[PDB]
Amino acid sequence: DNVKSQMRKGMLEYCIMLLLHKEPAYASDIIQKLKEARLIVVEGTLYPLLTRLKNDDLLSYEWVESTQGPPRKYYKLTGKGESFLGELEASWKELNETVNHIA
Amino acid sequence: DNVKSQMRKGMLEYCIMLLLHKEPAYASDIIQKLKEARLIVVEGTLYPLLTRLKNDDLLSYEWVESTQGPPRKYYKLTGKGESFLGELEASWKELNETVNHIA
Numbered sequence: 001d002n003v004k005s006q007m008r009k010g011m012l013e014y015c016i017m018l019l020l021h022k023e024p025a026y027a028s029d030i031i032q033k034l035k036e037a038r039l040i041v042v043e044g045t046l047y048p049l050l051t052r053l054k055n056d057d058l059l060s061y062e063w064v065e066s067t068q069g070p071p072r073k074y075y076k077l078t079g080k081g082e083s084f085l086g087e088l089e090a091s092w093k094e095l096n097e098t099v100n101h102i103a
Numbered sequence: 104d105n106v107k108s109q110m111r112k113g114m115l116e117y118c119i120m121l122l123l124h125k126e127p128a129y130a131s132d133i134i135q136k137l138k139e140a141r142l143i144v145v146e147g148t149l150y151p152l153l154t155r156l157k158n159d160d161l162l163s164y165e166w167v168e169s170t171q172g173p174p175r176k177y178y179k180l181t182g183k184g185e186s187f188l189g190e191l192e193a194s195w196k197e198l199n200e201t202v203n204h205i206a
């Protein structure tokens with residue numbers, strides 16, 4: 001219920017930070033890169049997490065302004081985002097020295 | 104702040120479920136197996152997560168009753184815990200088909 005929900009948000013949040021770490025991207029680029037990974041994540045799911053990560057200053061954005069379409073948010077992983085990402089990746093790595101003790 | 108906190112709880116929660124998946128254990132066994140993994144996690148950190156995972160029926164416990172010491176909680180990963188754990192491990196695995204698209 002609550003634990004499952006937060007942990008699943010966490011996985012998706014980590015995945016967003018992962019995808020943004022090399023290239024900045026529109027939400028639509030993120031959705032598309034997920035599609036290539038055989039993952040469907042809709043706007044209803046993706047948008048609030050982007051907002052949550054921006055609010056904690058892990059992501060930041062600038063508006064891309066046009067005359068042809070609406071303003072689009074162009075997201076990048078911040079300094080704080082890159083450091084926290086580095087922490088998490090090393091923690092998954094440690095979680096395989098754990099996977100030795102479990103088995 | 105908030106995102107960092109929930110994501111770190113998530114990592115530890117996953118680690119607890121990982122450690123409990125083969126063997127049931129006292130909190131002290133979990134702390135000890137973490138010590139062997141070069142990880143220090145104190146009671147103040149571990150206890151509320153165990154409680155949180157039990158409350159979502161991912162863990163369950165029975166009291167070990169003695170005349171020599173106090174009652175001790177003996178924890179195991181539930182059916183629901185094992186299934187959710189299986190979901191998460193496969194999701195980390197998928198997160199390496201993601202790690203190809205990131206690079």
Ligand SMILES: OC[C@H]1O[C@H](O)[C@H](O)[C@@H](O)[C@@H]1O
Pocket residue numbers: 025026027028029071072073074075
């Ligand atoms: O607000 C416009 C939104 O749609 C655009 O297609 C972009 O993918 C996204 O970054 C932005 O949030």
Ligand SMILES: OC[C@H]1O[C@H](O)[C@H](O)[C@@H](O)[C@@H]1O
Pocket residue numbers: 128129130131132174175176177178
């Ligand atoms: O309540 C007693 C507590 O301490 C014991 O040492 C056990 O490690 C733990 O499972 C239990 O929660």
